[PDB]
Enzyme design. Structure first.
Site, PDB file in Angstrom:
ATOM      1  N   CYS A  56       5.518  -5.626   4.286  1.00  0.00           N
ATOM      2  CA  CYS A  56       5.095  -5.169   2.976  1.00  0.00           C
ATOM      3  C   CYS A  56       3.880  -4.275   3.232  1.00  0.00           C
ATOM      4  O   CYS A  56       2.779  -4.756   3.490  1.00  0.00           O
ATOM      5  CB  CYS A  56       4.708  -6.365   2.101  1.00  0.00           C
ATOM      6  SG  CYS A  56       4.453  -5.961   0.380  1.00  0.00           S
ATOM      7  N   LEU A  57       4.083  -2.967   3.180  1.00  0.00           N
ATOM      8  CA  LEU A  57       2.991  -2.060   3.440  1.00  0.00           C
ATOM      9  C   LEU A  57       2.760  -0.940   2.444  1.00  0.00           C
ATOM     10  O   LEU A  57       3.674  -0.264   1.990  1.00  0.00           O
ATOM     11  CB  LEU A  57       3.149  -1.447   4.825  1.00  0.00           C
ATOM     12  CG  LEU A  57       2.147  -0.334   5.138  1.00  0.00           C
ATOM     13  CD1 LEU A  57       0.736  -0.901   5.152  1.00  0.00           C
ATOM     14  CD2 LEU A  57       2.486   0.292   6.479  1.00  0.00           C
TER      15      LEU A  57
END
Length: 149
Positions: A87-88
């Protein structure tokens, strides 16, 4: 070739040219739309030493749409899901057609060191990163150990 492929080859050339520290990556012989990369756990951090294997999945929409990245290796991080999905920031809401694989690769390397608390993908990892950072580093050490797999 298509716009996508050509760009990725250019992206590879750069990475090849002047690679970022502790970051490696190359596409797979079948379909240049799938890559395999390696991120070394940044120095002076609980992820130190560990050698992480990742995969990058591109669409024929690159660079307009970003790829999806997963940790092949076993991972423990407030921003990494059960299947290794990362999750970036720049990988979603803040993506730029300007960014390249080296860039993407470099960012994940840093996230390792500085997980963003904003809604963690792994609540347990967050729980510790916060409440007890003592056992947090304890679990990561366990992963830093796995990498060598």
């Amino acid at each position: 070739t298509t716009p996508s492929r050509r760009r990725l080859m250019r992206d590879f050339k750069k990475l090849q040219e002047d690679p970022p520290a502790g970051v490696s990556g190359a596409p797979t012989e079948d379909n240049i739309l799938t890559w395999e990369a390696i991120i070394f756990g940044p120095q002076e951090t609980p992820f130190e030493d560990g050698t992480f294997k990742l995969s990058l999945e591109f669409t024929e929409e690159y660079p307009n749409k970003p790829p999806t990245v997963k940790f092949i290796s076993k991972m423990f991080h407030p921003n990494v899901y059960a299947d290794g999905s990362i999750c970036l920031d720049i990988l979603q809401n803040r993506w730029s057609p300007t960014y390249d694989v080296a860039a993407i690769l470099t960012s994940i390397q840093s996230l390792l060191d500085e997980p963003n608390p904003n809604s963690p993908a792994n609540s347990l990892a967050a729980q510790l990163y916060q409440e007890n950072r003592r056992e947090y580093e304890k679990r990561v050490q366990q992963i830093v150990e796995q990498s060598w797999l």
